Amino acid sequence: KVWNARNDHLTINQWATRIDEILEAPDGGEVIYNVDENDPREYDAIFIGGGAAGRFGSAYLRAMGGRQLIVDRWPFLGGSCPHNACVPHHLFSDCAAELMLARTFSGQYWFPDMTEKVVGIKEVVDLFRAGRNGPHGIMNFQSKEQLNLEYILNCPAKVIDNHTVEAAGKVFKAKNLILAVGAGPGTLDVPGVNAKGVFDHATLVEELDYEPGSTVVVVGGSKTAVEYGCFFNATGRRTVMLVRTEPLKLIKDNETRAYVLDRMKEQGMEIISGSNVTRIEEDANGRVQAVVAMTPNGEMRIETDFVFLGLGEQPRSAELAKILGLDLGPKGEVLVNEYLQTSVPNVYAVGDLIGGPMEMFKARKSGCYAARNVMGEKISYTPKNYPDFLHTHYEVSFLGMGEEEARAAGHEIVTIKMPPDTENGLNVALPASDRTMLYAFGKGTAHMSGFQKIVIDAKTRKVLGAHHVGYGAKDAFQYLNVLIKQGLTVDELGDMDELFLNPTHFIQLSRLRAGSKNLVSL
Amino acid sequence: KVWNARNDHLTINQWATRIDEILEAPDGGEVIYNVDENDPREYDAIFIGGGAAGRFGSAYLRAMGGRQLIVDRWPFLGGSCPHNACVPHHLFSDCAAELMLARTFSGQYWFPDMTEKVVGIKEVVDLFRAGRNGPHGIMNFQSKEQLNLEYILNCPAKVIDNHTVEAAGKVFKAKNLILAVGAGPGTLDVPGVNAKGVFDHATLVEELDYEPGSTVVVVGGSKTAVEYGCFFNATGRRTVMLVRTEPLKLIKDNETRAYVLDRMKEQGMEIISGSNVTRIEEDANGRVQAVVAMTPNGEMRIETDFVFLGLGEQPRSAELAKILGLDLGPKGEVLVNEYLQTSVPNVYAVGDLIGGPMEMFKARKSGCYAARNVMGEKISYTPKNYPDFLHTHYEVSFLGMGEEEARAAGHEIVTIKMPPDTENGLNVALPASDRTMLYAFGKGTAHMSGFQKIVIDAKTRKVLGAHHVGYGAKDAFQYLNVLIKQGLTVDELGDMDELFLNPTHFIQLSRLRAGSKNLVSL
Ligand SMILES: Cc1cc2nc3c(=O)[nH]c(=O)nc-3n(C[C@H](O)[C@H](O)[C@H](O)COP(=O)(O)OP(=O)(O)OC[C@H]3O[C@@H](n4cnc5c(N)ncnc54)[C@H](O)[C@@H]3O)c2cc1C
Ligand SMILES: Cc1cc2nc3c(=O)[nH]c(=O)nc-3n(C[C@H](O)[C@H](O)[C@H](O)COP(=O)(O)OP(=O)(O)OC[C@H]3O[C@@H](n4cnc5c(N)ncnc54)[C@H](O)[C@@H]3O)c2cc1C
Ligand SMILES: CC(=O)CSCCS(=O)(=O)O
Ligand SMILES: CC(=O)CSCCS(=O)(=O)O
């Protein structure tokens, strides 16, 4: 069943409703056909996948005046982020931060008693499921009515050759193909991995039909594992993380990483490094009852009825690589040159499909650049020197070099941080700003107010790296990184206008030291 | 009683304790004398006041190799901000934001029933009083041990002439004086203004010995009035704001202002424009019982036992002007040229003492620029095109021109905002990020997820203004403003690396429109 929506103009909320209906449809739902029947031009590019990369790539290509076509197996545009990736992740992280606050000040002011309070994980996941069609509605609307895009949703794409694709029972031709099918959840090849009670970011928001027990086991040690792990811990459950190597290796500054790990442990999280799951035990009904793993100190068994796999995402290259004969990398990523061109003529690859970094900025930009190249604008794209972030119970932002990294690299440096290095350590009222004021003023909670630092080259006076743990600096790192790439110095940072009290105190702290020709750490 | 602390080296926490002791000492406390009695150099400048302007100016002067002396009547450095201004303001705004969240989701998830819950204002003020010495301790420690500053605290400065100052019973000479005594609370010339129950930012944290009733009257529409007003409202009290002119004029963009005001009213706040208090009624016990004011709709009477004055701060220029013969402005501000020089030879004026804008960046920067001039470096300072912000129950950030302002300036423009202007209005799941996810997904709460907009010149493609209501963008505005002053275009904005989900969605949204030669609003 195909629905020609081309001449239909549903509102954001109407789209939200129609999408929900199609998703919960037993037959699978009708195909959303939004194609221009009067355009004589041949598609400059057909996007296989309409997620972050595909949608943005199409938006830009269309803006340039070219013709595009999106084909996605989901009845909505936007991809994984709004359905099971970044959006739910941020809802969960919001809860983790709010819950850490409530537990810290339990039984104080307007804060209820959290002593034996266990928050429902399913209730929050259900909250997400109940409102995720909202964002999906905005995407279908914005893409059609505002971005003037053509698309076919709720129907998998069928790639015949580098110029032909079958969709909605029809066959389409294009000058180029832009592969943007993203990546899928990583898994384990251990007994019990298919048991009821084992989840990943994708299945968690589709198959959680019970409320997890008191203990949760998380497998992995990077972003996803830590973000979801802190949320589970925040709901009041004993959370054990089994990390194959070492956790949070993305945090290069040693002190910053230590602060983050220390605060996670203070919240009760257990992180076991060098551990490898060997078996997920099933009970008589096929449900998880425990996790067995090998560690540096021997085998261990953790009783649990809920296991979350937070492993790296894997590029969905298999099918396309076989159909087109694409050259692949060691992790299955599709190989491409600086112009996003694969080994197959007129075939580009973007987003998570081409590997790391697997972030939205990389997906959207690669999608746009591939589009520009398809339109004749030869432009290279090699992601490098970008800001990054992750959530624990705090927002953790970082860019550039860590302190030890800079000194080992041959850079004479000075650092400016908060709190200062003294015998009182973290037990002081700074750093402090929006969302950390209660920690800064509470009895025995000052050490929880945050940690931040900038690394500066003592000779060039340029900022080499910035690190922040707390809240409200993430957005700033987007803009600060650009200034740093321009050659930002401690003097220029000190000359800015701060908005006190600020999440990052970099501006004024730089000003305190910038008056000297021979910089000194603070 | 003078304590020579020069060769003593207290830790941050020992300083916190010592300062508290001196502040609570019945006799007034001992003088804190930190002077290098062995240094034979003349003082380049004596700073009258060691607040934001005096402390930063001293730090910069010392960094440049000059010699300085700070004299302050309080036993700590840092001024009003940590004792009764910005720091408590932020603790209160943090509470206001958390309380709106709790009230919005009352009885939902882990949130307790807030239906009939009135938070204790005195409890929060007491929390502030109990922990404010922490920041004070850091300031005394940082200034002495890290910034190598000389200072005399807990002693009023007694200026003799433009080169001589008395402090701690000793007479000091200097090449220049830098006046940095700030400003004091503004008051009303009406009957009953001195009744018990009438407070300003300063007296609120020193004399609140009772818990306010169910109604609070706030006089003024300034940032402070609005910030404290929303906090009082958040505690569960009927809050009436008596604004002299138009509410929130600082927010130039009409749409942004409307959103902010509408959200305040949704929380139950009553905002009265063009109102002037005529009398504060006292009961037989000498306590405020009602406020009477004239408004565009006639005289009104509001019963209350707690009134908060959020009027403009007044420069502390009287005594210094009499002694030195300083030229003053109509509001009592000390007049200075662009080098921060007063009408008196070798005497500079900085911070709130020289008038608006009364902000920390202005205080600190003016202090440093005066210091540089004292050290022989001719440098002018004229605050202009700076970012700004204020708190309601949300963080409100703004810079540059509002939409209407831009068109009146002759610019042909386009705008990029969230949420989109459609039939569904604000009732959609965008904008969304950290701390707005629950609002975005909650039943009927989507409209509370925020509002944001950038104003762009259609021809030059340059960003002319940025506006945001939500959380986590404040810090970013510090850096974004610098980029905008450099001539940021929509294309350059789109070329940045975003950190999704981001408080400001400006980067990716700009990218969605940047591909066209003829820009169209989103
Ligand atoms: C738990 C989690 C949290 C994350 N948090 C963040 C974060 O905070 N910030 C950030 O920047 N990044 C985050 N990411 C990563 C980010 O989600 C991805 O990098 C980005 O979504 C990838 O976009 P893409 O366009 O390459 O793929 P996707 O957006 O995943 O979309 C691929 C699209 O192709 C479609 N498709 C697949 N196969 C076919 C087929 N055969 N036929 C038709 N359509 C097909 C899909 O249905 C989908 O719409 C997170 C990821 C995870 C897993
Ligand atoms: C309620 C409130 C909230 C605010 N919130 C913000 C905000 O969020 N962000 C922002 O940027 N700005 C904010 N401000 C404004 C900011 O507090 C001021 O602009 C800044 O503190 C002024 O610094 P200053 O150095 O000029 O004066 P101050 O820092 O106030 O210090 C003047 C100093 O001089 C001393 N002094 C006075 N008389 C004498 C004397 N005779 N002898 C010796 N010492 C003397 C004082 O004891 C004091 O230490 C706020 C103000 C108020 C009132
Ligand atoms: C409304 C929504 O889907 C938020 S998740 C971002 C999807 S996209 O703009 O990167 O396609
Ligand atoms: C620690 C503290 O006082 C925070 S308030 C800022 C005071 S100053 O650095 O502007 O002097």
PDB file of C-alpha atoms in Angstrom, chain A residues 172-319:
ATOM      1  CA  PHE A 172      14.792   5.059  -9.902  1.00  0.00           C
ATOM      2  CA  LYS A 173      17.868   6.320 -11.731  1.00  0.00           C
ATOM      3  CA  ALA A 174      20.496   8.741 -10.456  1.00  0.00           C
ATOM      4  CA  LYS A 175      23.801  10.265 -11.508  1.00  0.00           C
ATOM      5  CA  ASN A 176      25.247   9.434  -8.092  1.00  0.00           C
ATOM      6  CA  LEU A 177      24.503   7.402  -4.986  1.00  0.00           C
ATOM      7  CA  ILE A 178      25.177   8.520  -1.431  1.00  0.00           C
ATOM      8  CA  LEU A 179      25.223   5.617   1.019  1.00  0.00           C
ATOM      9  CA  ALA A 180      24.046   6.756   4.452  1.00  0.00           C
ATOM     10  CA  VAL A 181      22.672   3.643   6.168  1.00  0.00           C
ATOM     11  CA  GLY A 182      24.629   4.281   9.370  1.00  0.00           C
ATOM     12  CA  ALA A 183      25.638   1.600  11.860  1.00  0.00           C
ATOM     13  CA  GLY A 184      24.080  -1.004  14.134  1.00  0.00           C
ATOM     14  CA  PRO A 185      24.549  -1.972  17.825  1.00  0.00           C
ATOM     15  CA  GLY A 186      27.649  -3.958  18.736  1.00  0.00           C
ATOM     16  CA  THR A 187      27.193  -7.374  20.339  1.00  0.00           C
ATOM     17  CA  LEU A 188      28.973 -10.260  22.093  1.00  0.00           C
ATOM     18  CA  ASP A 189      29.571 -13.827  20.915  1.00  0.00           C
ATOM     19  CA  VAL A 190      28.903 -15.307  24.360  1.00  0.00           C
ATOM     20  CA  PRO A 191      26.297 -17.834  25.577  1.00  0.00           C
ATOM     21  CA  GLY A 192      23.136 -16.084  26.736  1.00  0.00           C
ATOM     22  CA  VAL A 193      23.590 -12.888  24.745  1.00  0.00           C
ATOM     23  CA  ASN A 194      20.193 -13.605  23.149  1.00  0.00           C
ATOM     24  CA  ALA A 195      18.458 -14.122  26.500  1.00  0.00           C
ATOM     25  CA  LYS A 196      15.476 -12.065  27.628  1.00  0.00           C
ATOM     26  CA  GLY A 197      16.901  -9.243  29.710  1.00  0.00           C
ATOM     27  CA  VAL A 198      19.838  -8.347  27.462  1.00  0.00           C
ATOM     28  CA  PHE A 199      19.525  -4.940  25.782  1.00  0.00           C
ATOM     29  CA  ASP A 200      21.446  -2.358  23.762  1.00  0.00           C
ATOM     30  CA  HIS A 201      20.456   1.247  23.026  1.00  0.00           C
ATOM     31  CA  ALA A 202      18.187   0.115  20.183  1.00  0.00           C
ATOM     32  CA  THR A 203      16.316  -2.755  21.833  1.00  0.00           C
ATOM     33  CA  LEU A 204      15.984  -0.902  25.145  1.00  0.00           C
ATOM     34  CA  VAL A 205      13.444   1.516  23.682  1.00  0.00           C
ATOM     35  CA  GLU A 206      11.507  -1.206  21.839  1.00  0.00           C
ATOM     36  CA  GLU A 207      11.439  -4.306  24.042  1.00  0.00           C
ATOM     37  CA  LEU A 208      11.599  -3.318  27.719  1.00  0.00           C
ATOM     38  CA  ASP A 209       8.463  -4.991  29.086  1.00  0.00           C
ATOM     39  CA  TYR A 210       9.448  -5.222  32.745  1.00  0.00           C
ATOM     40  CA  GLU A 211      11.077  -3.138  35.463  1.00  0.00           C
ATOM     41  CA  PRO A 212      14.737  -4.168  36.040  1.00  0.00           C
ATOM     42  CA  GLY A 213      15.877  -5.619  39.349  1.00  0.00           C
ATOM     43  CA  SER A 214      18.214  -4.018  41.894  1.00  0.00           C
ATOM     44  CA  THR A 215      21.457  -4.785  40.053  1.00  0.00           C
ATOM     45  CA  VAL A 216      22.372  -3.756  36.517  1.00  0.00           C
ATOM     46  CA  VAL A 217      25.370  -4.945  34.512  1.00  0.00           C
ATOM     47  CA  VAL A 218      26.717  -2.696  31.762  1.00  0.00           C
ATOM     48  CA  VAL A 219      29.224  -3.972  29.209  1.00  0.00           C
ATOM     49  CA  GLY A 220      31.594  -1.392  27.750  1.00  0.00           C
ATOM     50  CA  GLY A 221      33.554   1.620  28.951  1.00  0.00           C
ATOM     51  CA  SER A 222      33.072   4.452  26.472  1.00  0.00           C
ATOM     52  CA  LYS A 223      30.331   7.050  25.892  1.00  0.00           C
ATOM     53  CA  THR A 224      27.193   4.903  25.569  1.00  0.00           C
ATOM     54  CA  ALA A 225      28.146   2.532  28.386  1.00  0.00           C
ATOM     55  CA  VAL A 226      28.886   5.394  30.775  1.00  0.00           C
ATOM     56  CA  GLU A 227      25.912   7.559  29.795  1.00  0.00           C
ATOM     57  CA  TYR A 228      23.356   4.790  30.226  1.00  0.00           C
ATOM     58  CA  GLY A 229      25.239   3.329  33.176  1.00  0.00           C
ATOM     59  CA  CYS A 230      25.062   6.574  35.140  1.00  0.00           C
ATOM     60  CA  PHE A 231      21.336   6.774  34.418  1.00  0.00           C
ATOM     61  CA  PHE A 232      20.725   3.245  35.722  1.00  0.00           C
ATOM     62  CA  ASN A 233      22.826   4.053  38.787  1.00  0.00           C
ATOM     63  CA  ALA A 234      20.857   7.278  39.314  1.00  0.00           C
ATOM     64  CA  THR A 235      17.564   5.354  39.450  1.00  0.00           C
ATOM     65  CA  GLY A 236      18.945   3.634  42.544  1.00  0.00           C
ATOM     66  CA  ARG A 237      20.351   0.393  41.180  1.00  0.00           C
ATOM     67  CA  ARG A 238      23.738  -1.179  41.848  1.00  0.00           C
ATOM     68  CA  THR A 239      25.522  -0.672  38.542  1.00  0.00           C
ATOM     69  CA  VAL A 240      28.544  -2.761  37.599  1.00  0.00           C
ATOM     70  CA  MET A 241      30.458  -1.835  34.443  1.00  0.00           C
ATOM     71  CA  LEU A 242      32.572  -4.526  32.780  1.00  0.00           C
ATOM     72  CA  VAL A 243      35.202  -2.762  30.674  1.00  0.00           C
ATOM     73  CA  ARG A 244      37.444  -4.776  28.357  1.00  0.00           C
ATOM     74  CA  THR A 245      40.267  -2.240  28.556  1.00  0.00           C
ATOM     75  CA  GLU A 246      40.060   0.990  30.570  1.00  0.00           C
ATOM     76  CA  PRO A 247      37.086   3.373  30.861  1.00  0.00           C
ATOM     77  CA  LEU A 248      36.745   6.821  29.285  1.00  0.00           C
ATOM     78  CA  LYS A 249      39.949   6.799  27.254  1.00  0.00           C
ATOM     79  CA  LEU A 250      38.499   9.725  25.274  1.00  0.00           C
ATOM     80  CA  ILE A 251      39.257  11.985  28.250  1.00  0.00           C
ATOM     81  CA  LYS A 252      42.946  12.661  27.623  1.00  0.00           C
ATOM     82  CA  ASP A 253      43.611  15.050  30.500  1.00  0.00           C
ATOM     83  CA  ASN A 254      44.544  12.799  33.423  1.00  0.00           C
ATOM     84  CA  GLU A 255      43.148  15.023  36.186  1.00  0.00           C
ATOM     85  CA  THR A 256      39.902  15.585  34.300  1.00  0.00           C
ATOM     86  CA  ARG A 257      39.461  11.854  33.712  1.00  0.00           C
ATOM     87  CA  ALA A 258      40.259  11.121  37.359  1.00  0.00           C
ATOM     88  CA  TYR A 259      37.697  13.652  38.575  1.00  0.00           C
ATOM     89  CA  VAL A 260      35.032  12.143  36.335  1.00  0.00           C
ATOM     90  CA  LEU A 261      35.807   8.576  37.403  1.00  0.00           C
ATOM     91  CA  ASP A 262      36.053   9.580  41.075  1.00  0.00           C
ATOM     92  CA  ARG A 263      32.603  11.190  41.004  1.00  0.00           C
ATOM     93  CA  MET A 264      31.121   8.124  39.309  1.00  0.00           C
ATOM     94  CA  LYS A 265      32.561   5.873  42.016  1.00  0.00           C
ATOM     95  CA  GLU A 266      31.291   8.223  44.721  1.00  0.00           C
ATOM     96  CA  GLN A 267      27.789   7.714  43.305  1.00  0.00           C
ATOM     97  CA  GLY A 268      28.243   3.984  43.843  1.00  0.00           C
ATOM     98  CA  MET A 269      29.211   2.847  40.361  1.00  0.00           C
ATOM     99  CA  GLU A 270      31.512  -0.156  40.147  1.00  0.00           C
ATOM    100  CA  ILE A 271      33.926  -0.177  37.226  1.00  0.00           C
ATOM    101  CA  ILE A 272      35.882  -3.350  36.526  1.00  0.00           C
ATOM    102  CA  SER A 273      38.693  -2.946  33.990  1.00  0.00           C
ATOM    103  CA  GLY A 274      40.265  -5.723  31.938  1.00  0.00           C
ATOM    104  CA  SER A 275      37.057  -7.728  32.136  1.00  0.00           C
ATOM    105  CA  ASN A 276      35.487  -9.907  29.459  1.00  0.00           C
ATOM    106  CA  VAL A 277      32.026 -11.415  29.756  1.00  0.00           C
ATOM    107  CA  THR A 278      32.195 -15.176  29.248  1.00  0.00           C
ATOM    108  CA  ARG A 279      28.557 -16.087  29.841  1.00  0.00           C
ATOM    109  CA  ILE A 280      25.188 -14.495  30.481  1.00  0.00           C
ATOM    110  CA  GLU A 281      23.344 -17.011  32.660  1.00  0.00           C
ATOM    111  CA  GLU A 282      19.756 -17.859  31.810  1.00  0.00           C
ATOM    112  CA  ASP A 283      17.132 -19.064  34.266  1.00  0.00           C
ATOM    113  CA  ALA A 284      14.638 -21.839  33.495  1.00  0.00           C
ATOM    114  CA  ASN A 285      12.470 -19.374  31.567  1.00  0.00           C
ATOM    115  CA  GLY A 286      15.228 -18.041  29.333  1.00  0.00           C
ATOM    116  CA  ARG A 287      15.708 -14.820  31.286  1.00  0.00           C
ATOM    117  CA  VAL A 288      19.040 -13.401  32.428  1.00  0.00           C
ATOM    118  CA  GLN A 289      19.819 -14.351  36.034  1.00  0.00           C
ATOM    119  CA  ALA A 290      23.542 -13.502  36.194  1.00  0.00           C
ATOM    120  CA  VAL A 291      26.664 -12.482  34.300  1.00  0.00           C
ATOM    121  CA  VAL A 292      29.954 -14.370  34.474  1.00  0.00           C
ATOM    122  CA  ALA A 293      33.176 -12.657  33.428  1.00  0.00           C
ATOM    123  CA  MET A 294      36.933 -13.119  33.466  1.00  0.00           C
ATOM    124  CA  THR A 295      38.954 -10.352  35.110  1.00  0.00           C
ATOM    125  CA  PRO A 296      42.601  -9.714  36.092  1.00  0.00           C
ATOM    126  CA  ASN A 297      41.817 -11.142  39.527  1.00  0.00           C
ATOM    127  CA  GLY A 298      39.911 -14.143  38.188  1.00  0.00           C
ATOM    128  CA  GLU A 299      36.364 -15.145  37.276  1.00  0.00           C
ATOM    129  CA  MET A 300      33.428 -13.279  38.803  1.00  0.00           C
ATOM    130  CA  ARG A 301      29.653 -13.781  38.870  1.00  0.00           C
ATOM    131  CA  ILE A 302      27.227 -10.872  39.193  1.00  0.00           C
ATOM    132  CA  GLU A 303      23.570 -11.653  39.827  1.00  0.00           C
ATOM    133  CA  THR A 304      21.249  -9.549  37.679  1.00  0.00           C
ATOM    134  CA  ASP A 305      18.162  -9.700  35.480  1.00  0.00           C
ATOM    135  CA  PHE A 306      19.119  -6.741  33.305  1.00  0.00           C
ATOM    136  CA  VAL A 307      22.202  -6.414  31.103  1.00  0.00           C
ATOM    137  CA  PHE A 308      22.949  -3.399  28.927  1.00  0.00           C
ATOM    138  CA  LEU A 309      25.453  -3.651  26.090  1.00  0.00           C
ATOM    139  CA  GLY A 310      27.101  -0.307  25.422  1.00  0.00           C
ATOM    140  CA  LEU A 311      29.492  -1.393  22.704  1.00  0.00           C
ATOM    141  CA  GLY A 312      30.711   0.456  19.640  1.00  0.00           C
ATOM    142  CA  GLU A 313      28.302   0.789  16.718  1.00  0.00           C
ATOM    143  CA  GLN A 314      29.121  -1.278  13.604  1.00  0.00           C
ATOM    144  CA  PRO A 315      28.841   0.127  10.032  1.00  0.00           C
ATOM    145  CA  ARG A 316      26.039  -1.463   7.987  1.00  0.00           C
ATOM    146  CA  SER A 317      28.245  -2.220   4.984  1.00  0.00           C
ATOM    147  CA  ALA A 318      27.645  -5.951   4.354  1.00  0.00           C
ATOM    148  CA  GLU A 319      24.825  -5.801   1.788  1.00  0.00           C
TER     149      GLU A 319
END
